[PDB]
């Protein structure tokens with residue numbers, strides 16, 4: 001694993017880029033889920049569907 | 050494990066229980082639909098419509114017939130497939146209560162992997178999940194799997210299976 005991180009650093013291949021991006025999209029999702037839950041509360045299941 | 054199609058007696062129970070917004074144990078089979086509703090013909094007619102949609106046909110006097118005698122009358126012509134009402138209610142449960150990313154097929158997968166319950170008994174667990182619908186959408190994946198676990202144990206208790 002220490003030889004892998006040395007080979008990454010040489011090639012300039014950020015290993016965690018994919019996990020960083022995933023955590024931004026997952027915080028965006030949790031913001032939109034909060035906005036839809038608020039509209040489903042102020043209008044109701046029957047109305048929104 | 051052993052694959053069983055959901056009994057009409059459980060489907061009927063869950064549909065009544067969900068419409069009245071009460072737990073399965075709070076609804077006794079002995080009582081008639083007309084007794085349970087409590088003089089509100091609107092809700093009575095909403096239950097009758099949902100059972101008529103789900104099972105296709107109804108008996109001649111479904112109002113005065115007790116729930117165990119309706120469940121036995123439906124089992125004579127019931128196959129084991131959910132139908133047009135159960136399928137839609139489960140889709141509305143999953144969409145409205147599971148976290149953004151968790152679909153029905155992920156629930157079906159989780160039940161087939163974690164518990165090993167096949168499609169026939171997945172449908173049963175999902176019906177027990179419908180009967181005990183939570184208040185607000187489950188925040189994370191881990192408490193959504195913990196809910197599916199609590200519904201598997203409830204399903205296993207009522208049907209009489211060991212997990």
Ligand SMILES: *OP(=O)(O)OCC(C)(C)[C@@H](O)C(=O)NCCC(=O)NCCSC(=O)CC(C)=O
Pocket residue numbers: 089090091092
């Ligand atoms: O359960 P049930 O006893 O069979 O139903 C009882 C009643 C009729 C009371 C129930 O369905 C109900 O509450 N209905 C709403 C009141 C009502 O009948 N409103 C009529 C809406 S249409 C209309 O009013 C046409 C018009 C004359 O202009």
